[PDB]
Amino acid sequence: KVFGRCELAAAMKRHGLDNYRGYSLGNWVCAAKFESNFNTQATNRNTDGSTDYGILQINSRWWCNDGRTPGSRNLCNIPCSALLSSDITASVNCAKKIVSDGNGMNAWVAWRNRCKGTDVQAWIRGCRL
Ligand code: NA
Ligand SMILES: [Tb+3]
């Protein structure tokens, strides 16, 4: 599923990401926009053999099992395919565990490089919330 900006903002608000670990909703929408362009089926193969999956491009090295990342973990205890569903529940729950790590939203490279320090509230501007 390919979300619209305000449609995802509402879906993410409904699943508790607004101010989760102190990160306002706009941070989450901005991160999803640049990680996946709001596409739940987005995947990106990394040079270490791992793959990033879903709306927030969650990586198989630590967070999910895809059966093809040599030396990996599955801390969200899910198959990586669960991060590609039209229902964003699994992606939100695993994102909650990632952001609870010592590095917070810095875990998402696109968030750190394109969202952090910006006027992120602009990402929820004009949205039904
Ligand atoms: Na894994
Ligand atoms: Tb850590």
Side-chain angles (χ1 to χ4, degrees), residues 75-97:
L75 301 158
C76 291
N77 295 296
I78 44 153
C80 295
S81 64
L83 305 163
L84 307 178
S85 181
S86 60
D87 171 349
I88 70 170
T89 296
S91 275
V92 172
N93 279 332
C94 187
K96 284 169 175 176
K97 192 179 179 75

Side-chain angles (χ1 to χ4, degrees), residues 59-66 69 72-74 80:
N59 193 266
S60 54
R61 168 128 268 97
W62 282 112
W63 306 107
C64 62
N65 174 255
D66 64 6
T69 308
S72 75
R73 302 293 200 98
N74 174 13
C80 295

Side-chain angles (χ1 to χ4, degrees), residues 9-68:
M12 290 175 147
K13 184 158 190 176
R14 182 261 139 165
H15 291 91
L17 286 178
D18 194 1
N19 287 109
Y20 187 84
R21 250 282 263 219
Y23 290 95
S24 63
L25 188 53
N27 284 287
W28 296 98
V29 173
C30 182
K33 166 68 192 185
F34 297 126
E35 286 291 359
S36 69
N37 204 8
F38 309 142
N39 187 348
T40 64
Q41 302 197 77
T43 63
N44 172 69
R45 171 64 38 71
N46 294 102
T47 34
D48 70 339
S50 75
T51 303
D52 297 328
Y53 295 87
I55 203 83
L56 290 164
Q57 292 291 277
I58 293 165
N59 193 266
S60 54
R61 168 128 268 97
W62 282 112
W63 306 107
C64 62
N65 174 255
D66 64 6
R68 52 143 295 105

